[PDB]
């Protein structure tokens, strides 16, 4: 669930507004996704949106909704084991695009950025 999606951002990105720093940036990084992703935190994104709709094709399987059982200890993220397909598939495109924002630079340029034109 995107709101756990949330939890697993301010897991590995402690002074992160997940909902507000990732909603509007680059190509993939919010609502939709297209073109050639911008940058690095962008290409985590394209990542988690290709997750996400094969996360889809699950029976019945909404990485939008599911909710998921999932650990934040001090940084480390883990899905726990007994999350059902669709919770654990849903729950591993969160974990991998938590940490992938983790590693990658936030480039204020390409926070809310003209997607018609660029992607
Ligand atoms: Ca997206």
Redesign the pocket.
């Known amino acids: 669930h995107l709101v756990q999606f949330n939890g697993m951002i301010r897991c590995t990105i402690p002074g992160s507004i997940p909902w507000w720093d990732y909603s509007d940036y680059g190509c993939?990084?919010?609502?939709?996704?297209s073109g050639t992703p911008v940058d690095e935190l962008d290409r985590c994104?394209?990542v988690?949106?290709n997750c996400?709709t094969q996360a889809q094709q699950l029976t019945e399987c909404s990485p939008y909704s599911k909710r998921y059982s999932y650990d934040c200890s001090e940084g480390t993220l883990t899905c726990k084991a007994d999350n059902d397909e669709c919770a654990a598939f849903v729950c591993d495109c969160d974990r991998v695009a938590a940490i992938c924002f983790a590693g990658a630079p936030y480039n204020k340029e390409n926070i809310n950025i003209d997607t018609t034109t660029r992607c």
């Open positions: 993939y990084c919010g609502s939709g996704g994104c394209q988690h949106d996400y």
